[PDB]
Design a protein around this ligand. Structure first.
Ligand SMILES: NC(=O)c1ccc[n+]([C@@H]2O[C@H](COP(=O)([O-])OP(=O)(O)OC[C@H]3O[C@@H](n4cnc5c(N)ncnc54)[C@H](O)[C@@H]3O)[C@@H](O)[C@H]2O)c1
Ligand SMILES: NC(=O)c1ccc[n+]([C@@H]2O[C@H](COP(=O)([O-])OP(=O)(O)OC[C@H]3O[C@@H](n4cnc5c(N)ncnc54)[C@H](O)[C@@H]3O)[C@@H](O)[C@H]2O)c1
Ligand SMILES: NC(=O)c1ccc[n+]([C@@H]2O[C@H](COP(=O)([O-])OP(=O)(O)OC[C@H]3O[C@@H](n4cnc5c(N)ncnc54)[C@H](O)[C@@H]3O)[C@@H](O)[C@H]2O)c1
Ligand SMILES: NC(=O)c1ccc[n+]([C@@H]2O[C@H](COP(=O)([O-])OP(=O)(O)OC[C@H]3O[C@@H](n4cnc5c(N)ncnc54)[C@H](O)[C@@H]3O)[C@@H](O)[C@H]2O)c1
Ligand SMILES: O=C([O-])C(=O)[O-]
Ligand SMILES: O=C([O-])C(=O)[O-]
Ligand SMILES: O=C([O-])C(=O)[O-]
Ligand SMILES: O=C([O-])C(=O)[O-]
Lengths: 322, 323, 323, 322
């Protein structure tokens, strides 16, 4: 075989993992390995997903695995391995930072498998608490700083954009709304940077298409979106938008698209941050994270951003304190 | 003043299959979606998740949730998945679609009343098991036209048959035509004689040694047991990825008048000599709903297998009657 | 008895752009296609070629040719490319869209009569040059509603602006929002101040050294001269690939009620202080046709540039009147 | 750049070449090099096609070239370089075999460029007379027998399928109708192998959905299709379906899809043919031509097929006699 299909390993074959495998089938994006420590269930999803290729009229291979040797040759590795909530806790108290002790362990294990079997892979971490877990995976795997990132802000931005799109009665394709910072309560929906095809939202507000109050409401809703879905589902957390967000990042790498997809990236001076990962605007292409966009934030925005940075810093402290 | 409106599909049942079909509509920008369910909370969670996905897909369709039938008014297509997947108390090895009859008939009759009242002009695709029995139940309780009601099943069974064969021949399943007809259960009939590779009979490939007769038989059996295998492996519920795409593919063939050959459970009026019942047969789906029902020249041997499928349906329909 | 019919688009003019738009409909299974033209023979050749492509695309839409207006009856969208691309006798360097006025006005008035009689409920996208003048001509001669008639141009000009910027920043044009407004000619206005990278002002990238102010100016000029450059390089006719996709993208936004921001030539009723004329402005296209016309807060300097664009349109519309 | 985009070189930037570049833009299939001996026009199409990526929201590079060094690194090379008709001849007398003396020269030139700059490419010849030109290119370039083929039968089959689809009122996706043999008057539309989702057409005819006469008519129309379009266009020949046919073949190779796409392939015993290329059912995947399907043809079909083979043999004679 002269021309081989791309290969994506889903480390974690739960709700997000299986849905990403499904997206690969629909788009014929890559062969899929549904990896998990659980036996049985991953093979069931592999059978279900592989059978979907017939109806999709596409041809990719979808298999399951519980041995890391199986992810060798993966071009991309997407990591969802982990818990979505603290066992026993009420949905009312769902908190992403509370997952630290349960998932750091898992991420370290995955990091060892990737370092050993597919160290040349582009890695997209999804597992919460996102920013802390990306740093945890990067430290343990030893992969290049431009080849490891965390999916979060594309999802946060997708919410921000959908809410704005509904208010303005315009497709979200034409709404550029971005959230940066940590994937949590202190995420920063950049209201000043919201545009309708590059036209500042401020011009729409002055024309009465949206009020300042509605905007503030949308910014708050964007922050609470994940928790609302957790409250409403009553079992697990979001997976359709998360899966598509991660796969869009994976595709940008595989096809060297050079898309602006805000995600948790390694900092070395950007926004004055060092030795850590946090959500920032970035361009993803065949060279992995090709550009980290440094915006001219206002004093007010910097204040908000420093709060987001502090949450990551303290979480990274607790991580180390283990 | 909207002159050109989007198509609208109501997912009656917002569980695994319903939520996944909503996702497909978002990805393909196929139509606005209403995730209907008796359960409140969960469907709104999925509508939020699915609507947020439109931003990443760069598409624009409306995804909302509902627990009131008035909300499905104006639906062009209704896809029904409302129902139980497993019977409480049965082991996974004991899983049998027929046992769902008493639980789901009640549900399907309730849905029929809702569709009859709010969107009687819709094309209806039933998914709820036991499939052939539930499609008939929906049809008589709703009163919709015979060409506007069908059951998704054989497209999924055929997808399995095709994928297994594709794997063995090292050919894309796009180029494998393998069809299963009959009831969606142990007596389904994977038509080995009609399997082709771009119209070339599979038998020529077997004679050339590409694969064996024994492997074909193994695949025929694997196709029948596929659903139960996924139930066993998943440990919870049943298949949903291929089932969702099978139904959405049928919905799209109707919505865009594609005239696709998609085997499904259809109203019989003489075909293969059957009357007043629904059973899986090859059919053409277009803007006219079920536009053609293909009646294959089955051999005596294939007829014997098909007859068992028919007897199974007749038996469930009698059980349905006894309620 | 087809309950769900396919959308229908009539391509009035079956030349380079018309045939390519028909091809796009086949690839996306967007709608049935009628390739209309005064020329007989050629359009049937293209309908044959385009319909045969459905087999390979595995799609199913009808592509036919016509030279009688009765054939466009029932069209949901009409895209008009009927007209000359170059004036016989002019060198390629002398190519100017304004010179096409006398040749094309006659053609557009004939098309207007056909649409008015056979499919007055259609959404109409004019492509024929000189664009802004031809859209106005079509509108008054046809009598269609102001929100149902527009001209494709700025989506193409913007595509050029976006591609040039994308190349310099090494970012997909999906993430470059660059817009051109005004008349589709030398005085078009590429809005340098409104160029963004996913909503982030281009000026921040320039300050960071990603590209220079000088390169931006070069790109602004290149955007204005783009059509003439393709005319010069092709040696025959003019651009058709990007023009076809620009118009089909507008058609799809209408057909599927997407509500996309697609700058195009729209009827002015006060915006930017203009009345009784069509000119390129940012607009939202949905199932209601032109649903919104965006009025940007232009600076005095940008207004001066925009005013020249307006004067050019006013001048052609006067020339049109003098016929 | 860790992950690079696939690259396709269009040797010939005329109607088919430019349209294939357009398909690459729409599907984001690969970077495109529009090559030609003509300067000016290819750059115009490159500008037009590259500008279309903005509207398509895709990102591939489309450039033009007139120097072969420019096609280095091409994964696939699609060759349309050549004349579509004999200069001066009436459309009534259009004949594919008449192009031999004009295009053999061109193909030999292309063969030298490919051998020198991208010998590892999968090559799809489109230039007429197809079967003769594929053999001409293969002999001159020295490329592997499984990496060179000619696009023709996918197009012939597309016509056969569309005509049947229209009669039966079924999507052509569900009509499997295949033409094999030489791309010319003696091509062989395999009526006995026509199926509706694997169901023999014969069953439909007996049910009165199509008559034996209509079938015969469709077989004849399939043979004359190319000439009808030449007659009707009055300028050049078909390009929309040809372009999509060739790109579908290229994609099957690039994404290792393993599609059954009848095309002109190298024979070494199949159908008892040796040292020559002719249209046959074949599977295209990442290994190029992975399978050549050998059908159990009837005596009547063999007769017809031998006539198709003879046309290729004599054309290959004339080629040599130069
Ligand atoms: N960053 C984001 O935007 C975002 C959004 C949603 C969810 N998430 C997070 O993504 C993760 C996955 O969510 P989900 O809904 O798919 O969860 P899920 O519970 O459905 O699946 C997690 C899967 O990982 C598996 N797993 C556990 N330990 C493992 C190990 N050592 N190796 C391999 N697999 C292992 C589990 O068996 C399970 O199959 C959670 O941490 C969740 O909080 C992140
Ligand atoms: N025909 C086929 O090929 C095929 C394949 C797989 C599954 N199925 C069947 O499809 C059905 C759905 O499977 P699933 O995985 O989505 O199940 P699921 O358990 O995930 O969801 C079924 C949903 O229907 C809802 N429901 C119950 N009663 C309802 C009522 N009166 N009105 C509206 N909604 C109601 C439930 O609350 C639940 O959300 C099952 O009956 C299953 O056996 C059929
Ligand atoms: N607005 C834009 O952005 C833009 C971009 C490119 C080209 N254009 C213009 O679009 C038009 C079409 O360009 P093209 O490349 O398709 O040209 P073309 O020469 O290939 O085709 C124009 C077609 O219209 C036909 N025609 C002439 N009179 C007609 C009539 N009365 N009724 C029906 N058809 C008639 C011609 O026979 C021909 O087939 C030109 O006027 C060109 O300048 C506009
Ligand atoms: N096999 C099939 O099914 C099929 C179908 C249709 C057309 N064709 C054939 O495909 C070929 C191309 O058709 P088209 O419509 O694109 O033609 P076209 O006339 O539009 O373009 C042919 C192009 O090749 C160029 N060319 C000539 N000599 C060259 C050389 N030495 N190097 C590089 N480029 C050179 C020409 O300059 C021109 O741009 C013809 O031979 C035609 O008969 C084959
Ligand atoms: O992280 C999450 O679970 C979310 O935001 O959906
Ligand atoms: O009916 C089922 O559950 C199946 O076949 O997957
Ligand atoms: O109008 C034109 O011809 C252009 O811009 O391509
Ligand atoms: O070869 C040709 O020109 C054809 O068949 O279209």
């Amino acid at each position: 075989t002269v021309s081989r299909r791309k290969k994506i390993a889903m480390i974690g074959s739960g709700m997000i993992g299986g849905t990403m495998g499904y997206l690969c089938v629909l788009r014929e994006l890559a062969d899929v390995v549904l990896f998990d420590v659980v036996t049985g269930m991953p093979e069931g999803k592999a059978l279900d997903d592989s059978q979907a290729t017939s109806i999709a009229d596409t041809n990719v291979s979808v298999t399951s695995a519980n041995q890391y040797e199986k992810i060798a040759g993966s071009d991309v590795v997407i990591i969802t391995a982990g818990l979505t909530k603290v066992p026993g806790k009420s949905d009312k108290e769902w908190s992403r930072n509370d997952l630290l002790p349960f998932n750091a362990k898992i991420i370290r294990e995955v990091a060892q498998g990737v370092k050993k079997y597919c160290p040349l892979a582009f890695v997209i971490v999804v597992t919460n608490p996102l920013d802390c877990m990306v740093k945890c995976f990067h430290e343990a795997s030893g992969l290049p700083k431009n080849m490891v990132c965390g999916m979060a802000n594309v999802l946060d931005s997708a919410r921000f954009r959908r809410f704005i799109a509904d208010q303005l009665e315009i497709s979200p394709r034409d709404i550029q709304a971005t959230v940066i910072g940590t994937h949590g309560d202190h995420m920063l929906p950049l209201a000043r940077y919201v545009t309708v095809n590059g036209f500042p939202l401020r011009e729409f507000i002055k024309k009465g298409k949206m009020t300042e109050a509605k905007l503030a409401e949308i910014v708050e809703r964007t922050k609470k979106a994940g928790g609302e879905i957790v409250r409403l589902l009553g079992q697990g957390s979001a997976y359709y938008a998360p899966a598509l967000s991660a796969i869009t990042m994976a595709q940008a790498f595989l096809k060297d698209e050079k898309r602006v997809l805000p995600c948790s990236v390694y900092c070395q001076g950007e926004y004055g941050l060092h030795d850590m990962f946090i959500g920032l605007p970035a361009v993803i292409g065949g060279g992995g994270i090709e550009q980290v966009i440094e915006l001219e934030l206002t004093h007010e925005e910097q204040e908000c951003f420093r709060k987001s940075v502090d949450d990551v810093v303290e979480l990274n402290k607790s991580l180390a304190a283990l």
